[PDB]
Structures are given as C-alpha cells and as structure tokens.
Design a protein around this nucleic acid. Structure first.
Ligand SMILES: [Mg+2]
Ligand SMILES: [Mg+2]
Ligand SMILES: [Mg+2]
Ligand SMILES: [Mg+2]
Ligand SMILES: [Zn+2]
Lengths: 130, 148, 98, 122, 147, 216, 38
RNA sequence: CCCUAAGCAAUCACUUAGUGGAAAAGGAAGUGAUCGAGCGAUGACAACCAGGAGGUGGGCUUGGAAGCAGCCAUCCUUUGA
C-alpha cells in the first residue's frame, strides 16, 4: 500500500517529466531539505521526491525512463523536472550549493532523451540556455 | 446481592448434601450471553464465593486503573456464576457423629465449559489482561472467550 | 606470533600493576598489606604501561581472554567510585553513595 | 570510524552498477558523528569517466596504506576491517612508545604445554 | 558552521523589553550564556513592533558561548484568545466551549503565521487547518460566520 | 430479481472454499470418536423437504483442519450465515464425485472446554429455498456518533437477528450504522436495512442497541 | 540473586539463560532483575 | 540382558530427564508432528549508517510544568518518515 503511493506519485511526476536525476541527501537537515524542495517548486517547476530505489524503478520500467537502473544506489532524492527549462532547474541547485555551502550533496546521474549522462556530461546542458 | 459477597438471602433448607462435582460439562457447547469477552472454566469443580468475589474485584480494579475519564466506567462485567450451595464444618476436639455441623460458607458448582464472567465496553487487550488477572484467584483452569 | 590482545585498566588511589620476568609474572597492588602475584600461563605474556594499564598478549585466544578475566576477577570494579580493575572499553554504571 | 585514519580516498565511475559500496562508504564517513571524531582527516572523492573498478584506498595514522576491493565488498565489511587494522596499529604503537619491541613473539609450542589454572597468590 | 550544538533553549520575552534578569536570568545562566550582546541584538530586532508582545525566541546554545538564535512571532494560542475573547481556555476542551470564531480571524492569523522565517513554502490552507486544530485543542468553537 | 442489491454486503471471495467430504457408514459415538481420531469431523447433508424420514440425508465426514480454519477465520456466527460449496468424493483425493451441492452450515458443535469441532451440519440449499438464518450484526459509526462522543456507553442488546431468507441473497452480515444516535434513544429490528425479500421472524419492536446515559 | 518458582523478564534488557540445567534471568541494566528458578 | 525360566527379539517413530523409577498451581520454552497467520527479491527479519520534524511551550493546572506530576483535548501540516 505504501508502494501504491510511490507508484501514484511517480505516475503524476512523469506526466510532464523531461528529466530525472538524483541527489545524495546525506547530512541534509529537515529544514534544508524542505527549503531545497520549496526552491525547486517555485523558482523552477520540478518536483522532488524521496523514495525507495526499488519502487521508483519499477515505475520506470518498460517506460521511456528505462536505462537509469545502474544509477539507483545510495541515499537518493529524485528530481522529476516536469518543465522544459532544464537550465534554470540545474542553475538553482548550483545556487543552492554556493549559498548554503553543501558540497557533499551532489547530482548523481540523469536521464534525458533516453540517455544516461554523467555529471560531467549534463553540465554544458546547464550552460546552454534556450 | 449483598454487595461484594454473593450468596442467597435465604434457602429452603439450611444443610445440603455434599454432592459430586468432578464431572459435568455443557453438552451443546457454550456461547456468551451478554458481553463480547468472557472467562469460561475448562474443568469441573467447586468455587467459593470469596474466590468469585476476588476475581470480580480483580477485573473491576483492572478496568478502573487501565481506563480513565469517561471510558473508566464504560467497562461492564457480568457474573454468571453464583455460590448458592452452603457448606458446613465441625470444630476441633469434636468426635464424629452427633448430627451435621454448622454452616461455614458458600460454594458454586462449576461444569466444564461453564461461563464465569462476561465483559463488554473494553478493548480486547484489557479483556485478556483482566482474564489473566482473574484466573490467579481461581482454583480451576480457565480460558479466555471471545464472541465470534 | 601473538595475535590476540586484551587491555585492562587499573583505577584507584595507590593501585599499581607491575610485570616482572619477560611477561611471565604479574604483580598487583590492590590496597592490601601484600602484593597479589599471578603466574602468567604458557603462550600468554603480560605488560604494564604509563597509564596504569595491563596488557595481555598471546597466540591462544582462550588462554589470553581467560587470563584477562582472572586479572579482572582479582579486583572487580566497585559501583560507588569505579575503583578496581576493568576492561578499557568496559562501562561501569555508578550509583550515589549516601 | 575516523580515529585511525588520515585520508579516505574513494574513486568510482558514476554510471557503473557497482557503485553501491563506494557511495555507502561516503555515507558512513561524511556523517556528523564521523567528522567530530577526526576533523583533521581528509575525505577525497574522485569522480571519473573511465572504467576502472571502484576502489576505496585508505591510509592510516602511521603511514600504512591498505587498499580495498570496493566493487566486491560491502561498506560494513570495509568498516569492520578498518576498525581491526586500526586497533592493531594502535596496539603496536604504545608498544613501541613504551620501549617494548614489536611484534611481541612467543614460541609456537607452548600451546601443547599443559597450563594449570591461574590461582592468584599473595 | 562546525560547532556541535551544546543545547537549544526556547524563551518567551515581551517585545523590546528584554531586561535580562526575570525571563533572561537563570535561563541563560544555566548554560554559561552571555546576556548583553543577546539582549542588544534582540531589542535591535523587535523594535518595529508594539511593546508587550509575548514574542518567542529559540536560542541555539553552543560551546564557544556563541549565539545563533531565531525569533518567532507569538503563539497562535495568544493570537486566538486575543482575537476571539477571554484569556482563559477551557477546563475540559471539547466539552465546555468558551468562545467562538468563524473563519476570517483564522485567515488573518494564517496570513500572520506565514511570515515566520521558515514558512515561505507552506501554503495558507495548511496553516488554516492547523489553526482549526489549535482552536479545537482549547475548547474554542469554529463556525462559518458569526452574526 | 434474486440478486444482492447494490450497496449491500456480499459473501467474500477469500472464504469461498469448497468443503471436501467423504461418506460415513454409520452413526453414533463410536464411529464419531473413530473419525475424530482419524482427523475428521462427523457430518450430515440433508434437505428441508421430508423432515420426517430424514430429509434425504447423506452421512459424510469433513476434515478437522478445514472446519477449524473456516470457523477461526470467519467467526462462529459468520460461518453459520453463509452458503458453501460441498463436494463429496469416494475418498480423500479421488475423482468419484458422489454429490456436489451448495449448502448452508445449519449448525456446528464445538466442544465446551476445548472448542474442537465435534459435528457440522449442512442443509441443502438450491436456489429458491427459504431458510431461517441468524445473521450477525456489524456495528459501524460508533466513532462518529454524538452519544458516544459525550462519554455514554453502548448497550448492544442483540448480536444476531433471525431472518427468513431465500438462499440466493442471505447476507453475510448486516451493517448497523450508529452515527445518528445521541444519548437515550435506541434502534429496533425494523431499523435494519435488508433486502425486501427478507422477512423478520421476531417482532419489529425488538430493541437492537441503545446508547444509555453516561454517569455524570 | 532472587530465587523463586516463577522467574520473569521484567525489562527489555532481561535475558533468560539455561545454566547447569537451571533457568536463570540475567540483566545487563538492573542487578535487582537477576533471578534463579528454584 | 543378569539376579531369574524364556528375546543384547523384528519394523517404524519419540526421550537423553536415569525422565522412565513419587508430588500441584505456576514458570521456562528444549525437542519433534500437523494446520494456520503475518511479512518477504516490490528486499523481509538480525546487523551497521543517517533522520525521527513544524503549528506548539496544545489548553487547563500551576512555585514550575515545556512529549513525558495531574485533568481535558489528541487534531493538522510538511513529509521518505
Ligand atoms: Mg445409534
Ligand atoms: Mg536364563
Ligand atoms: Mg525418578
Ligand atoms: Mg510433574
Ligand atoms: Zn532487567
């Protein structure tokens, strides 16, 4: 029944999703975590969701978001970008690391147009605008 | 009635037979008549009225303590066993036969399966705990009964 | 080669521990009129350091652990001030002496 | 955790499906409890694009370095043998600091010698 | 920054009148905490408001005798028993109703209770239902409109 | 129109097992004890029609484990107010089906001390048979009722109500909603929501439940 | 050591152990809880 | 089996207490047999690691009672929680 929640939450999360990534949420306080979730929802259009690794992928199986399966280890927060404006969605977390000084919490792996880009790779996609 | 201790106000005769109590069951099975939870006996035997009242006091005190406020008084108990048989005895330094002795107490004859207490207006856990607390006052083997 | 180690702590004013002959003998001062002497068994050796700390080494785990238990049983820790012989990582829970 | 170590250098390829031990070790060693036991310690992360296997290579306080097979062993196993090796190096230390020769050595035939029970005597 | 938090104490002081002895006395004296800089920084903050506002402060005590405290606007209990009626909540709330309030005072307090430093992303419906919960905790009755 | 109405409880699919039976050659305490020693409960399958001369009776034995599991899972009253499929085979695991019938468990005897099953009675209920069934009551809405919010107590006077029921639409239970009950007033047997094809056997002025005055 | 016929676990730190064919209750927290059946 | 005439009898199970070869309420849960119940690769239990919050110090009581002396309420929110 608690998996039905995660199935529904990611079903609503993937209705307009263009981009899935992860954030290592080691050491983040509850106030910091809620602040990042709120920053991502008004300055951008992206919904953040902490869930099991095994549930999210099972709701990403037989789907467009199918090959992410290796990058589903560790304490992860899933950042379903439901807009098209990927550059602002990636810039606001860079602003978050710069302002709040949290360099242990990084963006690990992403899926865009069914391609798993490394964090080396989806940085020029933050550099380019529209 | 008579508050705590339960025995008849009067009897037709003062002195009764010993009788036999080691046998007797309920040949059709047993179901609760008033409550949702209950205590029934597993063996056949004799219970004194003091033991019945001790078990009733244990159930009442557990319901009084475990529940507070408005649900403290919402627990109800039914006593289905009644000590209506008088027992007699003779004093020391008295030889064997000069008639029956004076009455000394009251007993209840219990059969196998016979329901002793019934409970309602409480939780299942409190009913089980009150049944466990009441069983230690009784000389017969008992079992917790649930309505189903 | 000694693989197994167990470390004892001596707590108490005037309490001392002293090894004598290449680790084959242990001497304790536990507030008595004499010293308490323990003969270290074969394949076990003993050392004392500058923290009032006893060390038990050796190649048999059973003998080393048992000898450390024996040394602790010479003066087990008392509950009111923590004095006696105890393991280094052992937690003693104190109570208020009225 | 960090009371025997002076550098925890962890490197892994980000995409490879055996990164679980490395990221879990990063979870263990970057904790609030971990860095209040050794603020002088260094935790180094090297994210790389090539396909070397994940490798946790720690070095201890007395310069001893002992690498690990991160792709094949769990982070709790890594932590357990780090605790064991660090305790052994600490035992070897106050041994050398007090004039005792390290390693302490005994002949390997006193096991067969009979050992009577240790009775404390005056 | 790096300090392991020694303690965290909450504290109630009326607005601007922080003379450190009756409320700011043993409360900060128990944990070695300094009084002068704390009081000047507090009264340098709650000067914009009316005096005698029972404002609540959470002090994050430390080991280097340093302070990073957060000042919070007063409780919704005071906001509801000042904007509704008597200053005495029920003896048996949910059994003995004391004062009744409709929805609009709740809406205005929810507008006030969003201005806290850590509630920027909380929505007003959430705070409104929370305020109904606090009202039900006190015996205060809630309605649609009073006439 | 012989179907359960919308919004009414239906028998659950989880407890819709087939009761397996083998024939029994005799009656009495001797063969009953020998069957219970073999792990079986003595039984009988009969019908309403010729009550004199037996009811076209068939003596069978059912497994103790299945009967005990069904009585524990359903409950005693819920077992006796629900139709079952009974299959009679020549032996346990065979293929010679002797009778396959849809029957109501008319009675079950559990031992007064140990509550082990001693006897199960099945009455044949093809469609169009009217049976007197004791339907258990499920009380809901006690957390919403104004009478119990004020601290008053619930006097549950009846736990089962007897109804004459066609076999197709025997309700497994009747839900009694207590939500519109404040202190003092009571529900009677006429207030129970049933199918129109069910008839009360006892008078309609029989009190079911009553919220009695809490002690001030 | 408390010696009684009915030995019990009376806190979450109480463990039952069987030594020399006898039932004991040992407790890491409260030494009052230490019991022997007999 | 010997004492003691006749089996260290045969087959399949059980106990390791000399139970067998004295003794109850009650305790403990060893070792088997059968049927269930609940959870479980959607990752359960045990273990290790990180969080366990906000309205709020709920209202009353009250020298103080702040999750935790006592009475009443026991809701809501953000949440992975
Ligand atoms: Mg006959
Ligand atoms: Mg012979
Ligand atoms: Mg014997
Ligand atoms: Mg016995
Ligand atoms: Zn204990």
């Amino acid at each position: 029944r608690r998996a039905l929640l995660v199935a529904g939450k990611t079903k609503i999360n993937l209705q307009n999703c263009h981009f899935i990534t992860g954030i290592n949420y080691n050491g983040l306080t509850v106030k910091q975590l809620q602040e990042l979730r709120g920053i991502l929802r008004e300055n951008s259009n992206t919904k953040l969701l902490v869930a099991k690794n095994t549930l999210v992928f099972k709701a990403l199986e037989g789907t467009k978001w199918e090959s992410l399966k290796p990058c589903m280890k560790g304490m992860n927060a899933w950042i379903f970008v439901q807009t098209e404006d990927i550059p602002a969605a990636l810039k606001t977390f860079v602003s978050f690391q710069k302002e709040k000084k949290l360099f242990d919490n990084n963006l690990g792996g992403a899926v865009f147009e069914k391609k798993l880009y490394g964090p080396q790779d989806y940085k020029v996609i933050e550099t380019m605008p529209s | 009635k008579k508050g705590d201790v339960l025995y008849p106000k009067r009897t037709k005769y003062s002195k009764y037979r010993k009788g036999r109590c080691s046998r007797g069951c309920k040949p059709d099975g047993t179901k609760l008549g008033f409550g949702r939870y209950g205590i029934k006996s597993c063996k056949a035997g004799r219970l004194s009225y003091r033991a019945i009242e001790a078990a009733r006091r244990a159930i009442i005190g557990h319901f009084h303590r475990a529940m507070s406020g408005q649900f403290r008084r919402n627990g109800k108990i039914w006593v289905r066993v009644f000590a209506d048989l008088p027992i007699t005895g003779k004093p020391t330094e008295v030889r064997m036969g000069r008639g029956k002795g004076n009455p000394t107490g009251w007993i209840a004859r219990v059969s196998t399966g016979q329901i002793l207490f019934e409970m309602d207006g409480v939780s299942l856990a409190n009913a089980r705990q009150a049944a466990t607390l009441a069983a230690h006052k009784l000389c017969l083997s008992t079992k917790f009964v649930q309505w189903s | 080669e000694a693989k197994f180690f167990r470390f004892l702590k001596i707590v108490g004013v005037g309490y001392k521990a002293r090894a004598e002959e290449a680790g084959r003998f242990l001497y304790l001062k536990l507030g008595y009129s004499h010293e308490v002497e323990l003969a270290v068994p074969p394949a076990v050796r003993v050392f004392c350091f500058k923290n009032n700390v006893v060390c038990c080494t050796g190649i048999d785990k059973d003998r080393v652990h048992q000898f450390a238990a024996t040394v602790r049983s010479c003066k087990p820790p008392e509950v009111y001030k923590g004095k006696g012989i105890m393991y280094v990582d052992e937690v003693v829970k104190k109570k208020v002496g009225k | 955790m960090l009371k025997f170590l002076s550098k925890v250098k962890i490197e892994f390829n980000t995409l490879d499906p055996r990164l679980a031990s490395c990221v879990e070790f990063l979870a263990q060693c970057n904790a609030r409890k971990a860095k209040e036991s050794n603020p002088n310690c260094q935790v180094l992360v090297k994210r790389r694009t090539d396909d070397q296997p994940p490798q946790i290579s720690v070095t201890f306080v007395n310069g001893v370095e002992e690498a690990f097979d991160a792709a094949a062993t769990s982070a709790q196993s890594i932590r357990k043998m780090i605790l064991d090796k660090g305790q052994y190096l600490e035992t070897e230390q106050m041994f050398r600091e007090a004039g005792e020769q390290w390693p302490v050595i005994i002949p390997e035939e006193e096991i067969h010698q009979e050992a009577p029970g240790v009775k404390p005597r005056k | 920054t790096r300090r392991a938090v020694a303690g965290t104490i909450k504290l109630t002081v009326l607005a601007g009148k922080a003379s450190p002895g009756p409320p700011v006395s043993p409360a900060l004296g128990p944990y070695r905490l300094n009084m002068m800089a704390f009081c000047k920084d507090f009264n340098a903050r709650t000067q914009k408001y009316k005096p005698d506002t029972p404002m609540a402060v959470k002090i994050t005590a430390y080991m280097d005798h340093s302070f990073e405290f957060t000042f919070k606007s007063p409780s919704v209990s005071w906001y509801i028993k000042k904007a509704a009626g008597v200053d005495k909540g029920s003896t048996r709330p949910g059994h003995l109703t004391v004062t009744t309030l409709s929805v609009r005072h709740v809406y205005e307090i929810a507008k006030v209770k969003q201005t806290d430093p850590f509630c920027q992303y909380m929505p007003l419906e959430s705070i409104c239902k929370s305020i109904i919960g606090t009202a039900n905790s006190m015996g205060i009755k809630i309605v649609q409109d009073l006439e | 129109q012989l179907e359960y109405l919308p919004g009414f409880p239906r028998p659950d699919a989880k407890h819709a097992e087939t009761i397996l039976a083998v024939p029994r050659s005799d009656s009495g305490k001797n063969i009953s004890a020998k069957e219970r020693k073999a792990g079986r409960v003595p039984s009988i399958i009969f019908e309403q029609e010729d009550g004199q001369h037996g009811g076209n009776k068939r003596l069978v034995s059912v497994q103790t484990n299945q009967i005990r599991k069904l009585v524990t899972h359903l409950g005693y009253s819920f077992f006796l107010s629900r139709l079952f499929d009974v299959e009679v085979r020549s032996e346990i695991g065979s293929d010679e089906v002797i009778e396959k019938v849809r029957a109501l468990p008319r009675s079950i005897h559990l031992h007064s001390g140990t509550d082990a099953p001693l006897n199960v009675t099945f009455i044949r209920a093809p469609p169009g048979t009217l049976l007197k069934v004791d339907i258990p009551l499920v009380f809901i809405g006690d957390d919403v009722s104004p009478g119990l919010k004020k601290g008053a107590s619930l006097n549950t006077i009846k736990r089962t109500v007897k109804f004459l029921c066609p076999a197709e639409i025997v309700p497994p239970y009747i839900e009694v909603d207590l939500s519109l009950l404040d202190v003092g007033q009571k529900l009677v047997a006429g207030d129970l929501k049933v199918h129109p094809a069910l008839k009360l056997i006892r008078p309609k002025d029989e009190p079911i439940v009553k919220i009695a005055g809490g002690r001030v | 050591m408390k010696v009684r016929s009915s030995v019990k676990k009376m806190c979450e730190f109480c463990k039952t152990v069987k030594r020399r064919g006898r039932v004991y209750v040992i407790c890491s927290s409260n030494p009052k809880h230490k019991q022997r059946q007999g």
